[PDB]
């Protein structure tokens, strides 16, 4: 997270960390949408062009974390995947369209003060919160800078980082990339004349872009950290997966009934 802040403890109880077994390393961010399901970006598990293709046994899921590196024995919970689901039409070849993916935990997790699920939006909610100008929040343990002087510092944060960015008008988004953006994406960030900065960055992928409803006081996950051209560049914005549109697929996969 570029230009973010240390999050307060228990500020994003739905924040999940995607941990790789060997080598041990932080793969991506993710979110807990329930007792056994985790929502993340597809590109975190599969991106052929870089020979990226994780399977259920290569990863671990760590829920309830604050610190990036510590093993929070009393608070966090480590889970194993039972099955991974990637959107059938995830376009890793040209624009990362439908960059979404669900992961099914082996055993349900016990909610706590540190572990709590985020909500998925419904038609009206999406309709009224997803408006240009409105602010969303992004969280993660990714890079603090797009680039930095080697060995002179630490590109990564110690604790979970948080940033609040505004939603940008589609047209403004479209004119900022040579990429073919779809209706399954959205962009956020401040504009050059806005006076503020902020962005997600490598390591933040899969993380949730949430929004709070003033009428019910609940947090809704409206987007997923997807892709971006650098980090915190002027005249550039971050692209998020449009959770609401891909909701039927989620629905279809989950099978709560």
């Amino acid at each position: 997270i570029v230009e973010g802040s240390d999050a307060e403890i228990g500020m994003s109880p739905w924040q999940v960390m995607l941990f790789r077994k060997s080598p041990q390393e932080l793969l991506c961010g993710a979110s807990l949408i329930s007792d056994r399901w985790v929502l993340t970006a597809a590109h975190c598990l599969l991106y052929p062009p870089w020979d990226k293709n994780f399977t259920e046994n290569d990863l671990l899921v760590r829920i309830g974390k604050h610190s990036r590196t510590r093993y929070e024995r009393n608070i966090e919970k480590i889970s194993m995947l039972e099955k991974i689901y990637i959107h059938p039409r995830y376009n890793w070849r040209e624009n990362l369209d439908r960059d979404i993916a669900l992961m099914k935990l082996k055993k349900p997790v016990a909610f706590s003060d540190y572990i709590h699920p985020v909500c998925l939006p419904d038609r009206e909610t999406a309709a009224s919160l997803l408006q240009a100008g409105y602010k969303g929040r992004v969280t993660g343990w990714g890079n603090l800078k797009e680039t930095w002087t080697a060995n002179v510092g630490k590109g990564q944060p110690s604790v979970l980082q948080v940033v609040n960015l505004p939603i940008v008008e589609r047209p403004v988004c479209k004119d900022s990339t040579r990429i073919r953006i779809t209706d399954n994406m959205f962009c956020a960030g401040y504009k050059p004349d806005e006076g503020k900065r902020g962005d997600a960055c490598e390591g933040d992928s899969g993380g949730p872009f949430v929004m709070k409803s003033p009428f019910n006081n609940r947090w809704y996950q409206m987007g997923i950290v997807s892709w971006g051209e650098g980090c915190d560049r002027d005249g550039k914005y971050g692209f998020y997966t449009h959770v609401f549109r891909l909701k039927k697929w989620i629905q279809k996969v989950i099978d709560q009934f």
């Binding site: 590196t69 093993y71 194993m80």
Partner: peptide, 10 residues
Amino acid sequence: DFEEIPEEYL
């Protein structure tokens, strides 16, 4: 960096 997690998971 990472502190080591229980090996049962690794």
